[PDB]
Amino acid sequence: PQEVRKANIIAARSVADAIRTSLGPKGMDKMIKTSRGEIIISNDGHTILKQMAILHPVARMLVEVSAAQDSEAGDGTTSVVILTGALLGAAERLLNKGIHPTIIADSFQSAAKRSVDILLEMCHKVSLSDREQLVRAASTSLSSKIVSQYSSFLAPLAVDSVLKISDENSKNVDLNDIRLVKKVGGTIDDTEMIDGVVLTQTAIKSAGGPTRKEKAKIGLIQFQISPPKEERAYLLNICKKIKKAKCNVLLIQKSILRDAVNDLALHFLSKLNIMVVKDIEREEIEFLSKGLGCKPIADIELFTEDRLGSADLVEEIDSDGSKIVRVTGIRNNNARPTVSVVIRGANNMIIDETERSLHDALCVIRCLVKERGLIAGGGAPEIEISRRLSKEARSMEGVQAFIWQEFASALEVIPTTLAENAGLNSIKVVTELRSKHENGELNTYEEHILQPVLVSTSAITLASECVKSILRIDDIAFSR
Amino acid sequence: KPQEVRKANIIAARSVADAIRTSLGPKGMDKMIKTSRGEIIISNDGHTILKQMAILHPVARMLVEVSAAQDSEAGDGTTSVVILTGALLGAAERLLNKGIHPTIIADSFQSAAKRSVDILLEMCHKVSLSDREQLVRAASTSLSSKIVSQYSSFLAPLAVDSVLKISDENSKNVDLNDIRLVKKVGGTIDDTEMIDGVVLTQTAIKSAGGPTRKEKAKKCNVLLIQNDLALHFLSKLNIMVVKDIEREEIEFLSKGLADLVEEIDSDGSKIVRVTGIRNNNARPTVSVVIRGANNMIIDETERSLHDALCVIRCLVKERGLIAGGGAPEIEISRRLSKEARSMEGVQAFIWQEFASALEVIPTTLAENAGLNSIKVVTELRSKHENGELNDNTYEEHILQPVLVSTSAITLASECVKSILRIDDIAFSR
Amino acid sequence: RLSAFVGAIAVGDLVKSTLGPKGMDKLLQSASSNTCMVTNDGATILKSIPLDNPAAKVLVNISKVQDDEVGDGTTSVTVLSAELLREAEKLIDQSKIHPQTIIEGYRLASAAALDALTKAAVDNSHDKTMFREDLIHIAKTTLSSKILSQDKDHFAELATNAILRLKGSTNLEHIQIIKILGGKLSDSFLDEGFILAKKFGNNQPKRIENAKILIANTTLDTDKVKIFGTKFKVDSTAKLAQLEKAEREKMKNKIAKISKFGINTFINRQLIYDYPEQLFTDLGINSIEHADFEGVERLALVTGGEVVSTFDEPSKCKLGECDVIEEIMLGEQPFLKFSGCKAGEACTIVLRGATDQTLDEAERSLHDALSVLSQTTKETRTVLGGGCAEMVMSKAVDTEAQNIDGKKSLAVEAFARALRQLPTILADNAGFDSSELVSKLRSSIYNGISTSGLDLNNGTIADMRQLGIVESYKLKRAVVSSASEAAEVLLRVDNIIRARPR
Amino acid sequence: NARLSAFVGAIAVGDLVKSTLGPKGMDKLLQSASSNTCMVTNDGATILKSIPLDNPAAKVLVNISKVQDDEVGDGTTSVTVLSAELLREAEKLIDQSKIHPQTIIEGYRLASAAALDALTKAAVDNSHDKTMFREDLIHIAKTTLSSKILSQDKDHFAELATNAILRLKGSTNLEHIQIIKILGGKLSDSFLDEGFILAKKFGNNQPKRIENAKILIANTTLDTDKVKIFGTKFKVDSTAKLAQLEKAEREKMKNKIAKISKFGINTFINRQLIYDYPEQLFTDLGINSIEHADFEGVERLALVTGGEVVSTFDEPSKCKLGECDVIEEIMLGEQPFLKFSGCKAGEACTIVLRGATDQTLDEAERSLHDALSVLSQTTKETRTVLGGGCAEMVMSKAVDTEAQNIDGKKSLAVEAFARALRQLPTILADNAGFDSSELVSKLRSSIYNGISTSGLDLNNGTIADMRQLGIVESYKLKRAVVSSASEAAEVLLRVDNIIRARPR
C-alpha cells in the first residue's frame, strides 16, 4: 500500500512547493491558462488551486483547507499549503524506517494541541476594551493595498462594527451578515454605517414614485406585479391586500421570467406613498431574512402583518451616480444589530479592491474575538515553537520521540521561504534569528507589523488534520 | 509440474512401441532406417532396429537394454517385449488422471508378474531333456523361417546333441557364448564335424618345417601367439607353432580350455581339431563348424542356428513348453479378470487393466497377418473356454518355449518400473 | 477456484484496513472525479464499486442479511470470511480435503466457540433488584393502543415471569399461546402445564403417574386415505375383508417395538383404530392426538425428546418423561395440565377472551411486548474485547483439534488461525506490532488468565476488566453465524456461473 | 535475489534428491552432453555432486554434505532432505517478517535441545546381556596390544580397560579418564583409581585432609604483580614508594577475596601464586588454596564435578559449583600426589602407569587412547531407537512443549521448527504412494498425549504399532542428521547477500 501513498505525497509535494514560491508579496506569481483562453495572474493560493483543475484526488483537499483557512482565520492560505507539504516531505523518510502512519497521524494531532499552549504563553494578552491596538491592527494591514491616507479613516469604522456584534461568549460570528455594497461614484471619505440594513440596488426612477417614506414596514415578498398572463381591476386587489397590513415597502425578488412592477400600479401606489425596491438578488434573500427578522412570502395569502419588520425612516440619499437607499431603526429585539458598509468611488477598480481589503481587515479583528492576543509574523512564531521542542523531544520515548525532532524541522520551512522571497540568503537570516533568541523573544514591533494568533493556530490545526487524512487512503479504485 | 515431465517421456515411449508393433511376426511391416554414415539397412528384427536407431531420448533407451537382455537370456521375443512394455504405459495414462501414485502401479506389477508365471505353469506341459524326439522337432520348426528347408533336417540333431552333453542336471543358466559357430568358405551344409573338444578360428603354418600334427600335446608341444628363424629353431625340437591368433578368441579360449592334435582339411579349410581335453575345472566346450559355398549361406545359417540354441536354452533352464501365437495370453486375461474381485482398494483395479494389456500381443499377430483385428480376438476367448491349449498350432508345429513368455513379462515389469520412477531429468556433467 | 478464493480477498481488502476506529479509509472515484467522497463505511464501498467478478456478487447478499439484524459489524463479516478463504488455498494443494468436510469442521468449531464465549460473558444485570423491577414498567409502556391497557399490573406481570423463568433461549418457540372463548381477560394466569385444547381416550383414567413420553409420527389406522380409483377383484365378499384383517396382524410388529421401550404415553398426529388402541389398554398406553407441529417440537424440548418419526434400532432412542399428567375441565372444555417435567423450562400464557376479536389482538400485542423483554437479554450484555474474545475462541478450537479424524484435522486447525487474524488486523491499523501482541496473548491465556486482552493505548497486555473495554455479545454471534453461512456456499463452489444483468 | 537463490534455488536442488529418500522413493536420470555416458542411481550425494550448479548458494550445500560422509557416512540423503524442509519453513518466517534470521537461528538452538532430550528417554539399546559383551571386549583389547610394549601382560592391562568403560555410565570422551605416569616403576604394578589425581601438593601448613570441599575456578595473580616494569616512567621521592604502589593494587583484591567467603566454599583454586598476606587470611576464613591447576585438568575437573569455569566474577552468590567429600594428600614415587574423592554423581577413572623411562610412557598413553576409542565406539553403535515415524513425531510434540513459554517474536521461529519435523512422514508417504494428509493427521492425534506406540506402516498403508513389527532405527543416525541439518541451516541464514560465482 506504500506505492499509493508515496505517489500521492510526491504529487502533493510538487504542488506545495509550487505554491511555496508565491508566499509573501514579493513571491513568485503562478500563471494558469484556461482552456477557454482566460489567463489570471495573482499570488493568492486559494485562487490558483481553484482554477488549476487538479485531477489528483488527494491534492484537491488543499482547496477545502484553503477555504476553511480564509473562512476561519482569514489569512495564511499560502502558508497552510507550505506547512502541509512540509509534513509530507518529512514523512518520506518515516516510511523507510518502518513507521506505521497511525503513529505519524496521532503525533501530529498531539503536537498541534501542545503547540497552541506554547504560543499562548509567549503571546501578549490584550483586551477588546482598548481601542489603541484595535485601530493599529487594521491600519497596518492595509499597507498592502492602494489606499494609504484613507486607510486611517476606515480603521475606526471597522473596529466599532465588530465590537458591537462580538459580545463576549459569542465566539465565532457569521460573516454573511456583513454586506459590502460597492457602487460607482462618490469617494472613500464619505461613509455611512447604517446598522439597520443596506440593499444592493437603487429605487424606482420612474414618475410618481415617492422614493422616500417614514415609518414603514419592510418584508420579503416573492410575488410580482404583472398583468394577467380589466388590468387595473386585477392590480387593485393586489394593492388592497397590502394596505390591510399597512406595508409601505415592497421588495420583489429579481427574476428574468416576468417584469417587476407595472406602470399602471405606480399610479395606485403613489397615492398611498408605498415605496417599492426591485431587482433584489437571490443572495440577498437569505441576508434580508436575518437582520430584518422577516420571512419570505411566496403568495398573497401567506402575506401577514406579523412577518413585517419596522423602519423608522426610508429615504434615497442624493449622490453622484449612486442614489443609495438607507434604512435605520429596524427595532428588532430577536435580530442582532449587524453592520453593512457602503463602498463608493469614482473608478470601478477602486470599489473592487476596496471590498477585498475590508475582508481581511474584519477577519484579523474577528480573530481577537475567539482568542485574544497577537503574535508578530516574519518567522517568529514558527521558530519559537522549534526552540521549546528541542529539549522536549528528549523527554519522549519510543517511535514518537523521533517525530518531535522532525516536526520542529518542518516548521523552519515557513521562515526560510520568507527570507528567500526577499532576496536575502535563506540559511544566513535564519541563523541570525536563533542567535539573538537567547536574549530577545518576539523582536518587528517598531516596523508596525502585526499578525493575529488565530492565523498561526489554524495553520497548524488544519495542516495536522490534512496530512492525517492523506495517509488514511491506501488505495484508489474506480467507483461509478 | 513434476508429473507432466514424465508424461512427455511416456508419450515418446509409446511412439517407439507403436513403430516396432508393425514389425511383429514374419508378416510384419519392415522399417527403413537411413544411417548418418550413408548405410541403408532394413529388416523386421526389433533388436537390429533399436540398435541402429540411435535414440537420443533418455527413457526410450531402456527398451534397447531390455531387448539386449531379451536376446541374451531367452533369445526370442525382442519385438514382443517392446509391445508389452508400451501396453503398460498406455494403461498407466488413465491411472495418473485418477490420482494414483506410480509406486502402487510399479509394486502391483511385481505381484502381477509372479502370478502370471504360476498360472502359465499350470497349463504348461512339463517336459524333460531325456527325450530326444521332442528336441529335434523343436529346433526344426525354428529353421522354417529361412531359405534352407530340406537341408535343415540334418541340422536338427547337431544342435540337440551339443546341448545334451553340457546340460547335465540343475545347470540353471547355460551360456551359449561358449558355443561358437565357425564360418568357413567351401563345403556344404550336410558336411559338419562336431569336434567336441574345441575348434579354433585359424589355420596352421604353411611354411617348411612345421609338423602341423602332434600326439599328446599341451615340455610345450603346441603354443599360441597373439620370425621365420623361430619356426626353424622349434622345428628341430618337434614343437608345433600356431600364430596369428585373433584377439577376440583370447577370452574365448581361456574358458573352455590334448590326447591327439591333427589338421584335417575337408576342402580348403586347413583346420586343426582337438579332442579329449579331460579337464576337471573346465567343462566340455563344443564349437559348431558350418561349411558353405556362397557367403549368403553361412551367414543366414549362423542366425538361424543361433536362435535354435536359444530355444533349447530356454528348455534347459525352465522345463515345459507352450503353444505360441498368443494362445496362453487369452486365458491369463480371463483368469485375472475374475480373480480381480478377490483384492481390495486401488490395487484391485490394476488387475483389471493388467489383463487388458496382455491382449495386445495376440491382437497384433492377427493384425499383421491380414486377418480382422477385433474379429479374431473374439474367436480366441470363445474357443479357449471349452478347450485347453488346443488352439490348432500343435498340428502346425508352432511351439514357443515357456521361458520366453516368462522373461517377456518379467523384463516388462522392470522396464515399466524404471520408467515411472523417473520424475525429472537435468543436465549432469 | 482462484476467483472464488483469491478474487474474494481483493473484495475483502477494501474493508480489511477500515475495521476499527483507528482503521484506514478508502477512496471512491468516478469518471468525473469531482463526485468522490472519503468514508470508512464498508457497505457503501462494496455497493458503489461495480464488480465485474461474478463470484464477488455472493458477498453482496451476505451484507444485506447482516444489516437486517443490526447495523453494526457488517465490515467484520467480510473480513472474517476473507480469512477463511485465504487459508483455503493451503486446504487444496498440500491438504486435498473435501470442502464439505471442512465446512462440517467449522460447525463443530463454532459450537465450541459459542459455548466458550457464554461462560466468559458478563452483563450489567448485576443488582437485579433494580433491573427486575424496571422490566414490568417497560411492558406497561408497550400497552398503548392495545386492549391490554385496561389493567397494567396484572397483564404485564404475566409477561415479566414469562422471560426470566425461561433460563434459556428467549425465542417465542418456548412460549405456548392458547386462544379460547367464553371468559374474561382478567382471569388469565400463567401455567407451565402445557395446556392444549383436545383430549385423549374415553374409558382411560385422567391421571397418570410416572409417565414416559415418546414422540413419533405414523399412520396406524387406514392408510391410503383416498380410496377413489381402486379396483377390488375378489371371488367373494368375505375374501375382500381378508386384506384388511391381514394388515391388523402386521400392526403387532410396530406395537412390539413400542412395548419394548416401556412407555405408558404415546404421541400420534393421526388417528388409531380400536384394535391397536385396545391392545394399548392391556399394556397401559395412552395416545395423544392432534399435536400439530409446534406441539411436536415443543414437547421434545420440555421433556428432552426427539422429533424423529422412525426407529433405526431397538432400545436406542431419546426418551422423555413427566411425573404426573392431570386432566381438568374449564370453560366447558377438557384441559391437559402436565406436572413434574424433568428439566422442563417453558411457559404457557392462556388468553381467555370474550370473542374472536380480542384473542387476535392480544396474541399479536403479546409477541411485541415479549420481544422488548427478550431483547434485553441480547442487549447490554457484552464480552471482554481487545483481542480477548478472539483468542479465547482459539482455545476452544484447539480442544476439538485434539481428538479428530484425519480429514477434519487440518480443517479445524485452519479455523483457529483465522480467529487470531482479527486482533492481528486491528493491531496493524493501531500502528503497533501485531505479531508481537498476538503471540504473547496466546501464551498467557493458554495457562490461566482468561480475562487478559490487548491494550491499544499502551501497546501491551492488560486486564480488560480494569480498563473497561467490552464488546457486545450479540455482535459476536451475528458475525460467526453470518461467516459460517457465507463460507458454506463459497467453499462448495467448483465452478462460477455469471449472473444475468438486470 | 540473495535469499531467493538460497531458498528457491536450494529447494529446486533439494527437491531433486527429496523424492529419492527411502527404498520406495523415486529415481532420477543424470544426462550428459553426449547422453551416451549417462547412468541411473538412487544415491543422493552422487546426483548433487555430478550436476553442475551455477548457483553460488547451492555450492555450499555440497561442501556441507561432505561432512556427514567423512564423519559417519550413513544417512547423507536424509540430511539434505531435512535441511531443505528447514528452508521451506524459514522462507515463510522471513517474508512475513523481514527481520535478520539470526534471531530465528537462536530459536532453533532452543528447539534442538528439547528434541535430543525426548529421544533419550525413549531410547533402547542392545547392551542387554552384558556378560556376552564383556567377554568380547577383553578379547578385542588384547588384539590392539600387538606390536606395542604393553603386550608383556595382556590380562592385567585388558582388565583395567574393561572396568574403565562399562563403569562409566555416561560420556565416553577421554576427558573422563585421567592419565598419571611416573618413573622408576613396573608396568605390572599399575592400578585403577576412580579419583582425580594431581601432583605438586599445595601449601605448607595446610591440612592434608579436607571434609566437604568445594571447587571454584578463577584466574588471578595475587603474588608479584606488574611483571614488566621496564619502560614506564617512575617519578618517586623515595625507593620505598615503588613497593607501596604494588600493595595498593593488591589491596583492592580484598573485595574479590571477601566474595570467596560469601560463596560458602572452603577451597579456592588459582593458576598463579598467592602472596603470604592474602594466603594467611585464607586460614582464618577457612579457605584452601590449590595451585598448579594448569588448563586441561581444570576442564576435566569441572565436568566430573558438575561445575563451570570462568576467569572473572560477574556477581556474588551466582555460579555453578561442584563438590567433593574427602581430599587425601599422600606421597608415592618420591613425588607428592593429590587425591580427590567423594564427588557428587562423579563418574571417572584414573589409570596410573609406571614406566622405566620417558620413551615407554609416551608409547603407553598413545596406544591406550587408540585401544579405548575402538571399544567405546560400540557404545554408540548397534544402539537403536523405535522408528517408523514415531521418533520423528516425538521430536515434533517435544517442540510444542517449548511453545508454551516463549518470547513474542521467538514463537513463530520455534513453532516452524516443529512443522519441518512433520514433513518427514509427508515425504515418505508421497514417495511410498500413500496419502500424506490422511496418515500424518491421524499420527499426530494419537501421539499427542500419552500411551502411543503407533508408527508408520507402509505394508498395510495405515498406522500400526512398530514395536510388534520390529521396525527400529539407529540412535546415532538420529543425532547425526539433526546436528548436521541444524548446522547446515545456520550457514545459509547467516549469509545475507550472496554474490554470483564466476561461471566456468
GROMACS .gro file of C-alpha atoms in nm, chain C residues 34 64 123 161 228 239 281 307 312 320 345 400 409 415 444 484 492:
model
   17
  943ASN     CA    1  -1.550   1.562  -0.863
  973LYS     CA    2  -2.773  -0.730   0.332
 1032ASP     CA    3  -2.353  -0.828   3.189
 1070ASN     CA    4  -4.237  -1.404   3.460
 1137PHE     CA    5  -6.126  -4.350  -0.522
 1148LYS     CA    6  -6.249  -6.252   0.086
 1190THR     CA    7  -5.520  -5.075   2.722
 1216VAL     CA    8  -3.858  -3.536   1.665
 1221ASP     CA    9  -3.333  -4.705   1.346
 1229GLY     CA   10  -3.877  -3.813   2.778
 1254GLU     CA   11  -3.819  -2.490   3.105
 1309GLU     CA   12  -1.168  -3.006   1.941
 1318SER     CA   13  -0.767  -3.240   1.139
 1324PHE     CA   14  -1.012  -2.226   1.165
 1353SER     CA   15  -0.088  -1.604   2.858
 1393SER     CA   16  -2.050  -1.974   0.867
 1401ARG     CA   17  -1.872  -2.578  -0.218
   0.00000   0.00000   0.00000
